[PDB]
């Protein structure tokens, strides 16, 4: 990799007391991504691979 990484805190507009529930992340997949890959598929998942 060659570049710079930046981050800043945003509690002012990205959070609230009731909560904001607009974001998601994929924790289950039959295989890890390659560099800069993307997968936006949403389907039912079963550990058998069927």
């Amino acid at each position: 990799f060659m570049g710079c990484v930046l981050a800043w805190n945003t509690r002012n507009i990205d959070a609230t007391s009731t909560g904001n529930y607009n974001y998601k992340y994929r924790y289950l997949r039959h295989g890890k991504l390659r560099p800069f890959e993307r997968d936006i598929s949403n389907v039912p998942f079963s550990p058998d691979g069927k």
Partner: protein
């Protein structure tokens, strides 16, 4: 090798194996391009070059 002649018409899905050579012999622009994808059934991004 592949060939389209008279009734014959071949459009078979070919595996990519992470990279292909390609060559065509054409008299009057018979082949207009390709299509690259993984599932080709409403489930994965695909690209068209024509």
């Amino acid at each position: 090798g592949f060939h389209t002649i008279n009734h014959t018409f071949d459009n078979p899905v070919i595996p990519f194996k992470d990279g292909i050579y390609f060559a065509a012999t054409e008299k009057s622009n018979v082949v207009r391009g390709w299509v690259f994808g993984s599932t080709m059934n409403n489930k994965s991004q695909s690209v068209i070059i024509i």
